[PDB]
Amino acid sequence: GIREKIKLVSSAGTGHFYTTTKNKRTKPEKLELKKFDPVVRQHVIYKEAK
Template identity: 65%
Template sequence: MAKGKAKNVVIKMLSAAGTGFFYTTTKNPRNVTRKLSLRKVQLNLRTIMKFC
C-alpha cells in the first residue's frame, strides 16, 4: 500500500527576546494553520518569554 506524506512537521520556536534560545516542537499543518506562539521559561534569563 502507498503511504501518504508525514502529517507532523518539526518547528523551531525562537525566543522573542532575540537571545538565540529556542525550543523545538511538532505541528500538524492540517489542524493548526496559524502561527504557533507559546509562553515558556527561558532558562538562561530565568523568566517567562514568548516563543514564536
Template identity: 60%
Template sequence: MAVKKPSSRKKGNRVTIHLECTEARPIGKSPSRYTTTKNKKTHPERIELKKYNPFLRKHTVHKEIK
C-alpha cells in the same frame, strides 16, 4: 514476518517546527530555542507559546521560526 525498509516511514500532516524567544534579541541576550511538532492541517498559522528562557531566567513568548 515482513521487515520494513528504513526509507518507508510515515508521511503525514505533522511537521517539526522551531520556537524562538522574542524578548532576548532586542536586549542583546541569547535567544532560547525549542523544537516541537504541529499538525499543519489543523494549525496552518504560526504558533506562539510561553516557554522558559534559561538565559533570562523567566517565561517568555516564543514564536515559530522557519
C-alpha cells in the same frame, strides 16, 4: 510523517529556542506560547511555527 517538526524561538534578544511538532494541515496559524528561558531566566513569548 505529515506532522512536520517546528521550533519555537524566543521573542527576546536571546537565541534560545524549544523544539516540537505541529499539524501544518489544519493548524497553519503561527503557534505562540509562554515558556521558561534558561538564558534570561524569565518566561518569554515563544513564536515561530511552520
